[PDB]
Design an enzyme around this catalytic site. Structure first.
Site, PDB file in Angstrom:
ATOM      1  N   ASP A  23       0.894  -1.181   0.000  1.00  0.00           N
ATOM      2  CA  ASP A  23       0.000   0.000   0.000  1.00  0.00           C
ATOM      3  C   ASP A  23       0.926   1.223   0.000  1.00  0.00           C
ATOM      4  O   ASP A  23       1.696   1.435   0.946  1.00  0.00           O
ATOM      5  CB  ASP A  23      -0.921   0.101   1.248  1.00  0.00           C
ATOM      6  N   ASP A  60     -15.635  -4.883  -4.438  1.00  0.00           N
ATOM      7  CA  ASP A  60     -15.711  -4.984  -2.986  1.00  0.00           C
ATOM      8  C   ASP A  60     -17.108  -5.472  -2.598  1.00  0.00           C
ATOM      9  O   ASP A  60     -18.110  -4.887  -3.018  1.00  0.00           O
ATOM     10  CB  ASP A  60     -15.504  -3.626  -2.318  1.00  0.00           C
TER      11      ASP A  60
END
Ligand SMILES: [Cl-]
Ligand SMILES: [Cl-]
Ligand SMILES: [Cl-]
Ligand SMILES: [Cl-]
Ligand SMILES: [Cl-]
Ligand SMILES: [Cl-]
Ligand SMILES: [Cl-]
Ligand SMILES: [Cl-]
Ligand SMILES: [Cl-]
Ligand SMILES: [Cl-]
Ligand SMILES: [Cl-]
Ligand SMILES: [Cl-]
Lengths: 230, 230, 230, 230, 230, 230
Positions: free
Chosen positions: A11, A122
């Site tokens: 990330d 998602d």
């Protein structure tokens, strides 16, 4: 037994990335290198700066200096952002919200760039995540239907619930599409990797791993031994 | 005995967060990870930059990479700030001053987002905190009455006095509302956690913990053993 | 024997604060935490950035995460600066120059905020400090007279001479006003704390400590043992 | 034997200052504290940022937290810069070039601020330093004559040659003016301090020390033992 | 046996460069110095900031303070960027995309600067890399034909596939052009260096090394022993 | 035997300078101090930021706090840059490109500032370095002729070839001009210093040293023992 690919997470946040050795920060290259050193084939790189950024050079460094393949996501929402990301040389990108909010754009992207494009979804159970003041998460199967008509090469399904892997959903998507599906979320132990690897012959291609790594449930080498070494 | 949830604090200040190991600074992820490593289910994350900020990526990193649930507060005062916060995927938000200064807005937020919204109330005894040149802290029970009419799902009551937990107030609020109440402040030892856990059957759901941790009164594992392990 | 309160100093300079363990820098929270760890009830926090700043979040972190009470000074010179400081939740503020240059404003502040306001006076002997091209330090007793008429709750008197505590001046002010007085400066050893503690029954409430700490004359625990433990 | 005051140097450069323990950087406070810890009465603080800056808070921190007296120089060239410097509370300032390029301004400053003003003169032998395209260093004795007529309280004479202390020049200035003179430069060993201390009865008040400290010729405690302890 | 030159990589990213000792960051000088210390004759320096920058001083430091020769690439796409790069004094530059998108410009550059110019070609097998919305990687042999007509002195061929060295392609280019060719990519072990060194008599001049170094397949001294010591 | 002066290099790059102890970065003062500690009389300071900057305070710190003499170069190309550099108090400056591109300006500078001005010439053999799109390095002897007519006090000749010292060129320049010449480049061992020191009676005054230091060929003390101790 067919191998389950692992895509350990990197990330990029404020132009840096946490690395799990305890934790330390440094460059995205150093984080991806740590995974490569452990035997990773892929990293799943999320540019959170871009998502909510000018990390192009940092990303290009990873592509250029490492053997690991980069799956890049984060803020790839329009023609400029997508083209710039692909110009970095990454192996694959993931589209997210805009790809579902702009279906014709997504189709245009898939038509042009083919297997370089995967779409991320998602989910909470079988509900698409996201609620704004006037917008709601659409119907998962209606969204999937549009992506299938567009010829989307690959799906990345992230279970965002906090309250094991959803085998039934992953099964249904591989059967509706005949495309590779990459799972994320719902992994708390090496047994969950075993569960996912049993689905490789059905079309589950890989798993993004991150939460369980930071939680200390296992190390990446331990995960690779379970998921399979090529 | 029903469990008292703990919500150890993470304060984002100048884009970083103190971590209690002695103290060190680093990212919000590293602070929340420390608590998760100790057995935390929740963190109570305050974006002080936003309150008095562009920490969206830092917050999203916590949500995305950790199993701990995030209760996010700080500067959630208008449609844009609230919608952006919820888009980060956090489990819950806390509204504060504006939610009491703009009751119709608060009602609109509760109507739309439901149990994702809790309202924080800062108190000294039973007086609402805050005094400006022309504004004063309103009447606690008149404010609560408005929130109850709006159907507020959850209250976070922070005792800001510096001069144990206010059991009588927490009792009155759980009885007026029938909603879960989270306590903060008035905790100086593990005995105060025992006192609060006795109120779980009455509707006290949890405690934010922070001051006592930094004061060295106990560690988070010690607190979790007292508050209860699920 | 009545206790002399200690208010160890924390100076916020370039958004950080020195901490005395040798010296290191870090956040205002870490500096104030060091004092709290030693048994401090108060810290005297000076925002030098504001005085000569956007440290609001750093200050709010101290208020929110520590049990120590904060007396905040530095640049509190007008309606906006004062209101913003009090909104941070600090226990008390100190006004300085403007409070003497704008007596009606000071009166307005005292009228509205009461015991949250103390006024600081810098002195050399009994002369008010400060000399500009066209302005001079006024008459100490004429200034005090105006503050007394305004009902000022508390005075902080800082001896700025460099060439023990001025007992006679502190005595005169406590007798003219009947208000608590906090002393700063003129402390070179624990004996000076003894001298000041003898004045507690006359109205000397506390001492800010800083110079002697950094000079290594004593540690904060040693000072607290002398000044008194509540 | 009358004491020769020492004024060890602290140079503020890019908002930090070297400290001599080997070398490390940190705040001006930490550098001045090191000297105070060694027994210094004064520091000679040069704000090089201002000279060639917003270090006001850093300077105020030194004044406020240390017992050492600060002689401040650097960029004190006009009404605003001078007034702001004196507002920091420093014990003394040094004027430099402008004070010789603007004699009436210097006189105005001396008239208003008296013994808070000293004037620095950079010299090579008895020639004033400085050569531009159209300006040259003036006549040392003609400059001194103007400063004497203005009633300048104190002179700081810095020998800038690189090719011991100039006793003859220091003697001549103390005799022409009857004012204290502080020497800087020409110090390579403790013997040079002995030479300067012999001039204290003639009016040499002190020495700035810096080059010899960094060169390792002696430590500050060693210098203070030679120059004299009060 | 004729020596294969090695050009270990230095990537300038956010004004710094990773150094392989484990990894650390620092200046481009420190990274290039590490390679020089190991026996390198050349470094291949990529300014990724410029490619996707004001690193001119950092680059000039390498040129000026090190004996290693610098081959500089990254963002050398127009008259200003090229002229500025050559003004840094580097031994050689590499042109990339624009040199193929602007053939007349490339010819103009080669005509003026001669052997200071090499052209980089990124390839997957024998396909030129790069796909945008409306642009595709051209025909490798058609591009080479234009560069040969322009008299390009040297080619740098980078295999970007991730799915040993392409001996056939390197052979074909050396035979079509009679120019030196530098290989990059496809190196996983010292044996790959042996394979490339066998091609030195055919015109393969050198290899850029980077991926294998970071992967720990060998160290630079080990590589130099295999490639040859002059 | 007449001494060969050494001028070890200090390069200011991004407001810092590498120091050779291994390498570390810090301020220009710390780098120059390291050389002074080793016995250096001079440093050759290049402000690369200015060349390709606001390092005035950093440079002034070196001048003011160290006994070592500073020869300053980098970006001294016009009236303002030159005057500002000389105002820093440095012992000497070096002019470079503009001094050859603007001969009348160079003459004006030499006329005004005399022995504070030296001119640097970068050479490959006897060719002046530098090639742009429309400009080429001029004729070395024609350039020297202009500088000699201007009365240039001193020349700094840097051999920039990468493919021992050029004794013949240094001899010719000392004989044409009767001026001191400082050599840079072509030094790989202490023997090269011996070679240069033999030329001191002919007019070679000194050597800048840098590349050989970083290459570990010798240390500065070792070099000074060879070049000569005064
Ligand atoms: Cl890749
Ligand atoms: Cl995982
Ligand atoms: Cl969450
Ligand atoms: Cl607590
Ligand atoms: Cl407080
Ligand atoms: Cl004190
Ligand atoms: Cl002072
Ligand atoms: Cl000295
Ligand atoms: Cl080079
Ligand atoms: Cl390689
Ligand atoms: Cl100098
Ligand atoms: Cl050298």
């Amino acid at each position: 037994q067919s191998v389950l690919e692992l895509l350990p997470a990197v990330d990029i946040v404020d132009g840096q990335a946490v690395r799990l050795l305890e934790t330390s920060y440094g460059t995205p290259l150093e984080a991806a290198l740590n995974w490569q050193n452990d035997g990773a084939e892929w990293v799943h790189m999320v540019d959170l700066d871009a998502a909510f950024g000018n990390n192009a050079a940092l990303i290009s460094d990873v592509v250029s200096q490492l053997n690991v393949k980069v799956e890049l996501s984060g803020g790839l929402r329009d023609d400029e952002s997508l083209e710039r990301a692909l110009e970095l040389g990454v192996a694959r990108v993931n589209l997210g919200t805009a790809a579902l909010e702009n279906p014709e754009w997504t189709r245009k992207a898939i038509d042009r760039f083919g297997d370089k494009i995967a779409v991320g979804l998602d989910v909470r159970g079988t509900t698409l995540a996201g609620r704004g003041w006037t917008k709601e998460g659409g119907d998962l199967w209606e969204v999937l239907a549009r992506l299938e008509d567009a010829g989307c090469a690959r799906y990345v399904v992230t279970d965002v619930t906090k309250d094991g892997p959803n085998v039934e959903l992953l099964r249904q998507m591989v059967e509706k599409t005949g495309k590779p599906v990459v799972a994320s979320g719902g992994i708390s132990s090496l047994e969950d990797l075993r569960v996912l690897r049993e689905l490789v012959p059905l079309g589950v291609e890989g798993a993004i791993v991150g939460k369980a790594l930071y939680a200390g449930a296992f190390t990446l080498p331990e995960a690779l031994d379970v998921a399979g070494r090529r």
